[PDB]
Every structure is written in structure tokens, then in C-alpha cells.
Structure 1
Amino acid sequence: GTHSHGLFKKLGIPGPTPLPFLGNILSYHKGFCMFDMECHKKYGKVWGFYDGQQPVLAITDPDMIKTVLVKECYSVFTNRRPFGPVGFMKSAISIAEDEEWKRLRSLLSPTFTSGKLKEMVPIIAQYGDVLVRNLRREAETGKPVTLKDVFGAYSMDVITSTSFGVNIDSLNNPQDPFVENTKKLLRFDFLDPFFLSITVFPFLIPILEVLNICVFPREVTNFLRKSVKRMKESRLEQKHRVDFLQLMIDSQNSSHKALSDLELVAQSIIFIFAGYETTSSVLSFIMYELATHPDVQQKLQEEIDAVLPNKAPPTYDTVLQMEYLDMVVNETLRLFPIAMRLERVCKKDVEINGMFIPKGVVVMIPSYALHRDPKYWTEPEKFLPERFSKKNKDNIDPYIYTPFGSGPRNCIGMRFALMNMKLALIRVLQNFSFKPCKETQIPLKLSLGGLLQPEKPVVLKVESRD
């Protein structure tokens, strides 16, 4: 059971002492981040622990992080850690490995250029307006509002229209087929009973594969897989060139093997999976900060109105202008980096920056811990957007602050996500103010589980500026 539990004392690396079979996992009872902050305090700049028998080497030196994330990414640190029986989703770009990942990343990169994002702004923006109508009635009847649902509704609407050109009011059609299935594509909690069992019985993943058991619900994937083959074959026979689905079909008509029909479906799914709950999550987090910091919220309302007088519609170019807006988004992602950790598997035996790392270790960068480290962040607990002001932004290490990771395997959806969220916040603050309620959790607490989500759902009062 302790087959590899002696690796780190042989390399001279400090770490919590593992129990047989379980390794160190019992320390996840306070969750990944508190586990990581404490390891960082106690042991310093580098340390090791075991997810069961899997060695994991944490690193916090910005120079070493750059080597892993960008420098020898293609040679050594190309893939993330496996996490469960994925079925055909093995071909999704976030899951794919090595050379099929390089092929997939090269084939999907043009889809995320600012040119294609700029053509999608009018569609996203339309659901800014749907968000106001849905929120205008939730404020006109002064009931406290549950951000997650009003923002979930919004993220969903952006997802469906931006990926498949299906234009629905999900809040007012929670019965529609497309919103019924995507609502069940929730982020994975790697500390829940199932995924923890996997960590302690990783030898069970092939068994589950052979029974067609999949961490992606076997029925939503089927619905989308037929919906896509329905969309295509129909789409064939107009506007087009509007959504992701369309940009992907058109790349199947160009030195890399064009996406297969099934590779295509896999990417459509992973984009929905990445964007839906994450986007609503951060949007909830941003408003909680703006409600508990109404000076910040007001300074943002003023910047919105200066750029967009008369509740003028936001555009691509006006979004990129708004500097306080950018500052607020980044500072909310500092305190709540939805990822918590970045990881790569060490493909070979390598020495980086003076440290032998053996094959098969997963190297982990603990983003949440670095975003809250005193050694880089004055008053790290405080929501303080001025740290990203054009005056101070230059004294922040891009390898300490990595809300989207770094290097060739960074978030491919960063520009989109950033714009998507910004367009929401503008149209919302153009029409509304957000005040705390008796029911609001202040200060907010993070869950002890595996997702970076609030303990209790964020609820706030919302009054019409009108």
C-alpha cells in the first residue's frame, strides 16, 4: 500500500507523512486550499504529498512555474492528471493528451481569436437585455434575489446561442429540452464520495470504462451528440458563421487531420462544461464583492456611464476600454480562482531549476495559495481592486497570478469568458444597484468541498436605478 510512499524522503523533499493506502487525503477534510495554504506555511517553497499512491510535487517558485507551464510544456509537462472514466470525452481538448492535444489545440485555436470573439459580441449582448427583463421583475417585487440562478440563467442563454445558435429564455423556459440537459453539466467535485474513491482505487478506472460508466452523464452527452448531428445536416441549408458549432464545421473544410464528427461533438460539450457554471460562479462572486464594497460598485457605475452615457449599449471596443471594470474582474478572480490548482504530469525524468523530478509525479501549482500569500500580496484577504490599477499592475508576477493558467495549455476560453462576463456586468450595473440583505453571509465562507463555491448561496437586494 505504501509502495511509493517513500519517494519524497529519498529526494529530500519535506511533506506531511502519508498513511498507508490513503496517502494524505484525510487532510482534504478542510479542502484543497486550506490544505495548500498550510503546506505552504509549514514546508515553504516546495513540498510533496500523495493522493493515495500518486506522488504530487507542489511548487511555488515563479521561475520553476514558468519552466513547467511554458518552457518545457511540450517536452515534459504536456498533460493534466487523469481523473475518472471519460469514455469518448477522452477526445475533448482539456482531457486529450500529448500529440492529439497538440493537434486539437491547433485546430481549435482559430475559433478563439479576437476576430471571432468580436463577431459574437452582438449575440451575447442580446442576452444582456434578457438579463435585465428577468431581473427587472425580480427587483420590481422587492424579493431578495439568488444570484446563482439569475446568473445561471444568463450563462446558459449565452452558452446555447453562442455554441449552437439556439436562442431561448432559459429562466422562462426551464422546461425546454436544451436547458434541461445542460443544467445537469455541473463542475466536478473531486472531494465528493465518488471521485475520492477513485483517488484511492485508481485501479478501478479501467473497470468503470469497460462498463461504459462515465463522469459525463451518459444521457446528456447522447442528447447533445444527436442534437449536433441534427443541427448539422440541417444547418446544411444562410446566416451561419455565427456560433462555435459553425466555426468547427467550417474547419472540417480547410496539416492536421480535420476534426472528426465525434471529436467535434466532444469539443462542443467541453465548452458548455467549462463555461456554464464557472461563468455564473465568478459573476456571483463579483456582485458579492460589489455589494459589500458599495464605493467600488459606485465607482464602477460611474465609469460605465462615462463610457456609455444614456445606458448606451456596450460594444467590444467599449468593454476593452473600461479599466476599473477590468480591475474589479481581476481582483475577484484573485480571491476566487475557480481552478484552485494547476497541474501537469511529469512525462520523463527531468531536472528543472536545480531539482530532480522523477517520471510520473504530477507537478502542482497551488493558485489559491499563491493568490493569498502575504509574501506577494499586501492585505491579501481584502477585496482591493487598486492592485490592478495601471499604476501597480506592473508589480504582479504572472506566474503568481494565473486565474487562467499560463503557457500553451492555458485556458483557451479566456478572452471569451472575460468579455462574456464584462458584458453582463455593464448592462446589469447600468440598470441596477446591489445591496446586502439580512440573509447575506458576511463575511462569505468557502466550502470545504472540492469546488471553489460559497458555503451558502449568495443572496442580495437589488433596486432599480430607474
Structure 2
Amino acid sequence: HSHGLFKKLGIPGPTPLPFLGNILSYHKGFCMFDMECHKKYGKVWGFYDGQQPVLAITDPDMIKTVLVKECYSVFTNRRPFGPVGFMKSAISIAEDEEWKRLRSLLSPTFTSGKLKEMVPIIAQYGDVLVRNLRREAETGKPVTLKDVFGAYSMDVITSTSFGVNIDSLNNPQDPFVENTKKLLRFDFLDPFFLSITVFPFLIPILEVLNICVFPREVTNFLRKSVKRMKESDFLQLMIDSQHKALSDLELVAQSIIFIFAGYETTSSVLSFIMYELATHPDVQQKLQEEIDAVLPNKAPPTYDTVLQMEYLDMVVNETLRLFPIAMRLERVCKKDVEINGMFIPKGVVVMIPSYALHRDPKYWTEPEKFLPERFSKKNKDNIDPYIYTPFGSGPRNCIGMRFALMNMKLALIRVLQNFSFKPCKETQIPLKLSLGGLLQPEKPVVLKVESR
């Protein structure tokens, strides 16, 4: 789509260069670029990912219309992002009707009822984490969060997905661990992804040469492994629903996409939270005290005891305001429409700048401050769920939201129950976000760990 579009609609934005559009402006990252735009164009604005017109919108009403109201009719899909092969059938990648059919099939698989049943199995890998954390903190050495939580994230993933019970930290050898480690989030600012943003006409070329964003060796192993398992957790609940019709290949797709969506995310948010606890020892203390008041003398966490903890919730939700790892929510516009008096022409990408809104003065007091109290029950009724969107909104939000909260909360409970986390000379203060396309820390967070 040519570069006249936003002039002809009369929408402000940075003047695009030929071929590139505004990509060079990503040298700061999606996160800063989005702020600067909000700051200087106001409430609504447009830019070009190559030839692709992207309309940022920041009106809570409009957001709700896009994310909630017209989701089924107009704004159903995310923007295509690269050669995906069979993963076109993964719920997060799938489109229109085929997506609605898959969302319906998998919805009951993420019931609180089912979650409740998985708690005992997630709980088990708190004990494991604790154990691994004991040894390596008892050494006196500064721990690397990403590897500690990564190993935990996958421990909870392999076990809740495939029933395969492993100690990821003490089994790097295991074939099943080697592969799921490579299932990382894509950095859409790296050279591969920038290129196909500027050469989208290359996606079909790549499709045909069998090249795929989901590495073939990993996808092969997991399909051929689900092949065996099926011959004799999430796998099961899916097997059990066999429009309607979850098919064979559709099932492996989901299995894989649940790993993709949950692994580096969970472990990534967990890191950010421990960083905030270590740099705010008062918040750390207050939580450690709430946990003891509910689970006295290292009592094991449970579904209900987890949902009892206001301060925990406050800390988790406050960390997500600052570090909304999705950064943006997007939908592609299926047809010409008028939303809250605004004309959106077919093919444009509607983008909601979650990270920017999460840090907008209009909604937030001292937005840069880690301040769990914003989420206290007697002072959160003024938080707009269309401004605060770490899991998106509407029929296409994070299907694994409640699973990811519970899982994280179980990590933190066991970890804080046994330990305290502290600053160091390598600990970067304050934290500085990476310049690429993932919301991660520039240098992976290292902290000191002690036995309580």
C-alpha cells in the first residue's frame, strides 16, 4: 500500500522513505518509537512498515471497538509474519473461520477447572526449582535469572503439555529439552524479519523452498514424538475432542504453539518480577510476609491459596504494566469500515501500542515507578482494561492468561518462601531495555540469592 494513504485520510505520522517506509525509525525499538509517536501526534497516527500502512490508535473506546466489538466481522486476524508452513494451522496464526473453529475447540482446555487439575503438576516443579536454586545460591555465586526460570518454564511446559517429567537444568542431554529450548520468541527487528517486512513478496518464495520460521528439526521432533505419545496434560485434553473436528495435524500445531507462546514469555516475566523485588526489598519483604500469613512455615501453595494473595497479584500485575512483553496488539482490517467516526480502509494494520499506553501520563501517576499499590482493590477501579492490556482484549486475547498467571504465581511463592533476592555489582541499575524487537533486558539480569 502506497505512502499517500495517511495524507489522503488526513492522519498525522512520520514521513515515510521510499521502499523502507519508516523502518529506520526502529533503531530505537518498537517501544520507544511508539512513545515518541504518541507524544508528538496525539491520539491516532500512521506509519509504514515498508509498504504496509499501520494505524496506531489510542482511544479506549476505539480500542474496545477494534478488540471487542468488530473482532468477528472486521478485525479478526493478526498480520501475516513469514513462512509458517503447516503452523498456518496453529491457533495463533490461523485465520477467520478456521481460527474461530480452533478457538472454540481449545477454549474448554483452558478452563479454571482444568487449570485446577494441573496445579498439583506445576506445584511439583516449584520443589524442583527450589532444589536447583538451593545448591547454586548456597555456593554464594550470583544466579542468572533467565536460565533458572527458563529451566522452570520448560519443566512446567513439558509436563503440562506432554506428561513428560524432566529436570531441565539437570538433563540438558535429554532430546526433549534440546528441541524445546530452540522454541524462542521471534525478534521482528532482526535481519531475517526486517527483510521480509520490506520484501513481503518473498514470503511465497520462501514457503515454496520449504523454509520456515519454526525451525524444521524442532518441529519434526515434536510431531514424530506426539506421533508416539498418541499411540499409548494438554495433549490428552486435545486427544479427547477426537464446525468441530480437531484433526491430527491441527493438534500438533497447537501443542507446538503452546510451547512457543508460553516458554520464553513466562520465564521472561518472572525475571522482570524478581528484578523488581530485588531492587525494592520492601515490596519483597511485604510479599514474603503475605505468603507466610497464608502458607505458614513453608506450606505448599494451592489453587485457592494462590488466588487469595492480593499483594502477589498486585506485584505480578504491576510488573506487567512496566514489561508488557507483547509490546503491541495488532489486527488486520478485513474491509472498509467506520469505527467511532474513523474511516479505516481495507488492508491497513490497526495497532494498539500496549507498552506506550502502559506508560501514558494521562492514565498513570509516576509511570516509570514500580508501584504495586496501583492494583490494590481499593484503588484500581480507575484502571481502564483497554489501556492495561498485557494479555490483549476480547475474543482473541491470550488463551493461556489464567494458566500463565497461576504458573508464575506458583514459581514465586515457592521461591520467596525459601529465599531472598538481592542487587549486585553486575546488576544494572536502573534496568535498560534492549534495542531490538523483543521486550527483554539488554544484559540478562543477575541477582544474589540467599536461604531464609
TM-score range, shorter chain: over 0.9
Q: Deviations over 1:417-459 (max 9, x none)?
A: 0000000000000000001011100100000100000000000
What secondary structure does 2:107 align onto? Answer: helix
- 1:160 to partner: Cα distance: 0.2
Residues in 2 aligned to 1:152 and 1:441: alpha-carbon distance in whole angstroms: 20
Name the structure 2 match of 1:341. 328
Cα distance in 1 for partners of 2:39, 2:419 equals: 42
Post-superposition offset of 1:258: 1.4
**SS of residue matched to 1:394:** coil
- CA-based RMSD: 0.5
Deviations along 1:363-392, whole A, 9 cap, x unmatched? 000000000011100000000000000111
In 1, Cα distance between equivalents of 2:373 and 2:143: 29
Secondary structure of 1:277's partner?
A: helix
In 1, the alpha carbon distance for the partners of 2:293 and 2:241 equals 41
Instruction: Please give the per-residue CA displacement for 1:392-428, whole angstroms capped at 9, x wherever unaligned.
Output: 1111000000000000000000000000000000000
For residues 261-291 of structure 1, the C-alpha deviation after alignment (integer angstroms, 9 at most, x for no partner) is: 1000000000000011000000000000000
Q: Structure 1 segments of 4 or more deviating over 6 A? A: none
Quick one: distance in 2 between partners of 1:464 and 1:301? 13
Question: What corresponds to 1:244 in structure 2?
Answer: 234
* Mapped partners of 1:399, 1:321: distance in 2: 25
Query: For residues 207-241 of structure 1, what are the alpha-carbon distances to aligned partners after superposition, in whole Å with 9 as ceiling and x for unaligned?
Result: 0000000000011000000000110112xxxxxxx
- 2-structure distance, mates of 1:451, 1:34: 12
SS in 2 for 1:393: coil
How far apart, CA to CA, are the structure 1 residues paired with 2:406 and 2:388? 19
In 1: Cα distance, 2:137 partner to 2:216 partner: 39
How far, CA to CA, are the matches of 1:453 and 1:251 in structure 2? 37
User: What is the alpha-carbon distance in structure 1 between the residues aligned to residue 361 and residue 151 of structure 2?
Assistant: 37
| TM superposition shift of 1:77 | 0.2
2:132 and 2:416 map into 1 onto residues whose CA distance is 14
Which whole-Å CA distance do the structure 2 matches of 1:201 and 1:150 have between them? 38
The separation in 1 between residues aligned to 2:178 and 2:201, in whole angstroms, is: 34
Q: Which runs of 5+ in 2 are unaligned?
A: none
Counterpart-to-counterpart distance in 2, 1:197 and 1:373: 31
Structure 2 residue matching 1:395: 3-state secondary structure: coil
Q: In the alignment, is residue 318 of structure 1 matched against residue 318 of structure 2?
A: no
Corresponding residue SS for 2:182: coil
| Cα displacement string for residues 23-55 of structure 1 (whole angstroms, at most 9, x for unaligned residues) | 000000000010000000110000000000000
After superposition, what is the alpha-carbon deviation per residue over 1:85-141, rounded to whole angstroms, capped at 9, x for unaligned?
000000000000000000000000000000000000000000000001000001111
**Residue 37 (structure 1) aligns with:** 35
* SS class of match (2:404): helix
Deviation at 1:202, TM superposition (A): 0.1
The 2-side partners of 1:314 and 1:258 are apart by 37
Secondary structure of 2:36's partner?
A: helix
Matched residue, 1:271: 258
Cα distance in structure 2, aligned partners of 1:449 and 1:65: 26
User: Match of 2:347, SS?
Assistant: coil
Query: CA offsets per residue over residues 169-191 of structure 1, 9 Å max, x none?
Result: 01000110010000000100000
Deviation sequence 1:52-100 (CA, Å, 0-9, x none): 0000000000000000000010000000000000000000000000000
Match of 2:280 in 1: 293
Give how far 1:310 is off: 1.3
Task: Work out the CA distance in 1 between the residues paired with 2:94 and 2:256.
Answer: 14
Q: Which whole-Å CA distance do the structure 1 matches of 2:130 and 2:76 have between them? A: 43
Cα distance in 1 between the residues matched to 2:41 and 2:373: 31
Q: What fraction of aligned residue pairs are identical, expressed as a percent?
A: 100
Q: Matched residues in 2 for 1:33 and 1:180: separation? A: 31
3-state DSSP of counterpart to 2:413: helix
Measure, in 2, the Cα distance between the counterparts of 1:26 and 1:128: 43
Structure 1: unaligned runs, 5 residues or longer: 235-242
Equivalent in the alignment of 1:378: 365
Task: Please give the alpha-carbon distance, in whole angstroms, between the structure 2 residues aligned to 1:300 and 1:251.
Answer: 41
Partner SS for 1:183: helix
Counterpart Cα distance in 1 of 2:189 and 2:5? 24
Structure 2 counterpart of 1:81, from 62, 66, 79: 79
Partner SS state of residue 421, structure 2 = strand
How many residue pairs were aligned? 452
CA distance in 1, matches of 2:248, 2:429: 48
**Separation in 1, partners of 2:427, 2:371:** 20
TM-superposed deviation, 1:352? 0.5
User: Of residues 122, 125, 128 in structure 2, which corresponds to 1:124?
Assistant: 122
Partner of 1:105, secondary structure, is helix
Cα deviation, residue 358, structure 1: 0.2
Please tell me whether residue 352 in structure 1 is matched to residue 339 in structure 2.
Answer: yes
Q: Distance in 1 between matches of 2:231 and 2:450?
A: 47
TM-score (norm 2): 1.00
Q: For residues 330 and 140 of structure 1, what CA distance do their matches in structure 2 show?
A: 31
Which residue does 1:173 correspond to in 2?
171
The alignment partner of 2:55 has SS state of strand
Shift of residue 257 of structure 1? Answer: 3.1
Q: Secondary structure at the match of 2:56?
A: strand
Distance 1:4 1:270 in 2: 34
Distance 2:365 2:2 in 1: 39
1:155 Cα deviation from its structure 2 partner: 0.4
In the alignment, which of 82, 95, 98 is matched to residue 96 of structure 2? 98
Q: Give the distance between the partners of 1:372 and 1:120, measured in 2 at CA.
A: 35
